[PDB]
Amino acid sequence: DGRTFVVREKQVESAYVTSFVLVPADGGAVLDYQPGQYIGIEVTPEGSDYREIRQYSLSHASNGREYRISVKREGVGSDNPGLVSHYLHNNVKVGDSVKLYAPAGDFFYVERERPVVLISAGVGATPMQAILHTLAKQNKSGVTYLYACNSAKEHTFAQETAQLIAQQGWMQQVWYRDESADDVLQGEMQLAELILPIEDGDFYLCGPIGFMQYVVKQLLALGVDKARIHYEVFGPH
Template identity: 40%
Template sequence: MLSEQTIQTIKSTVPVLEVHGVAITKLFYDRLFTAHPELLHVFNHANQKQGRQQTALANAVYAAAKYIDRLEVILPVVKQIAHKHRSLGVKPEQYPIVGEHLLGAIKEVLGDAATDDILAAWAEAYGVIASVFIGIETDMYTNSALQPGGWRDFRPFVVARIDKESDVITSFYLTPQDQGPIASFEPGKYVSIRVQIPGETYTHIRQYSLSHAPGQPFYRISVKREDTNPTVPAGKVSVYLHNQVQEGDVLWLSAPAGDFTLDQTDTRPVTLLSGGVGLTPMVSMLHFLVTTQPNRKVTFIHAAQNGQHHALRHEIERIAMAHPQVTVAWCYTQPTASDASEQAYHKQGYIDLPWLQSLVPTVEGSFYFCGPLPFMKAVNQLLIAWGVPEDDRHYEFFGPSGALS
């Protein structure tokens, strides 16, 4: 337990962290990777270059300081980060390394303002927070390894099949190289893929949502090729998977992880909203719903640029044809002439509240949504405007969490 003096000292740094948090975390990562370049095998290099990881860590440090006397408030975020750490293979012995360089960055950025009392308080607080993470992650590693078909770290899987789903999204069907059983999972979870790309010094690890139902003899991930936006660096792993990985190749996978999962105790109508490649966890949820809750009404709404960018459409429509409780609706921002002639979409432009209400007549139900950040913000604001309670709004970010406000 932290002393009252330590708690008050940490709380006194909240305004400073609000102003200097990102500067501290940028310096922290510089110090960390300079002293321990081997950790570059674990961290997402793209998120580092774009500043997303630094911002995410700054937000986490700020929240920890703000709620240092009520850490249970941030426990959901802690568990979300712990899932990611477990899927990356983060180890307890790495926490002291992180603590050393985080405190060093605080001292360097704040200068004389970082008094001995402040640094001592943060050292004590970090020890408590790290022990919470280590405890949660230890349980996660144990549960992952002991579950039927489970394993602890990374396991080799063979690429059994590759399907091109759209101009930019491809599915990879993965089966265990040892031909043993594989762990089941809750729809919405992801796996980490670890690859050694030829010519790259460090391994790269990325998380991809599982896009099929549990209970299959394979895992399926559906990956967007991230090299179409000239303002954003190309995604090394996604391009490698699309350009170089072939059927028969081996990829190393973590066991399924993540806390964005379908509430299986809820029997109310459910609406699944997705944008772009954000449909992957929704398709997994859809497969699961029609087999385990066949009487539950499901509305599947997807936004895409056009039919050429719309992945897994025919698979979803086949499910809807076979299960009358499922309704689907497509929203295209830039439909092609072919899309128009085939009446391949239900709305042109963007999802808005009147159209959503025409498809889903009541807020009495649960809403799951996933996609690019602008899509997420727009959908969240629509649901708030409609009066959907916070507890019924479930979402996941791809990459480090950002604010939806």
């Protein structure tokens, strides 16, 4: 069964986000993909009669050996705690297996030899992470990384991203909505007071719709043509 993958690592990325490194158990194989794309993960949650399938963006660069995805605990401390995300967080240990369906998706980086801007918030960072590592392996110049999250504790991939930015000589800017920090802006992401490649860059977007629709209308306005704005949605939320 080529779908059977085992969890080799389970890393906490932030307060609500945990990563899973997955490898074939039963003779499957790690297929190539473009950064931005997703795989389907199938598990059978506790109590539940049924198998359940959810999509998760690859969060690292394609290497043919292992996949990484990064899962937000959805609906935490709420009326309806997300079914698959909680099961993954609470029950799927290193050494446990899941069934996995091959990479696919309409959203992915395309090399156009132009500047690149990655913008995300919250768990929308996941496909941006795959793109960052890919660009890093390609020694792409002209990369800007713009990221928003509620606070330091929800700052997903903070260290990993910072090392990459410094190593490749890129630039980044982070906003914490709910508190202040050094080199961090406080509040919602504000894109007027900083240097962006508006005329020629490609702008890649991923986050809650509210966060995005805001910034999608914002770039249309700033002169960027819609053909240069690319975005992913984790469903209609």
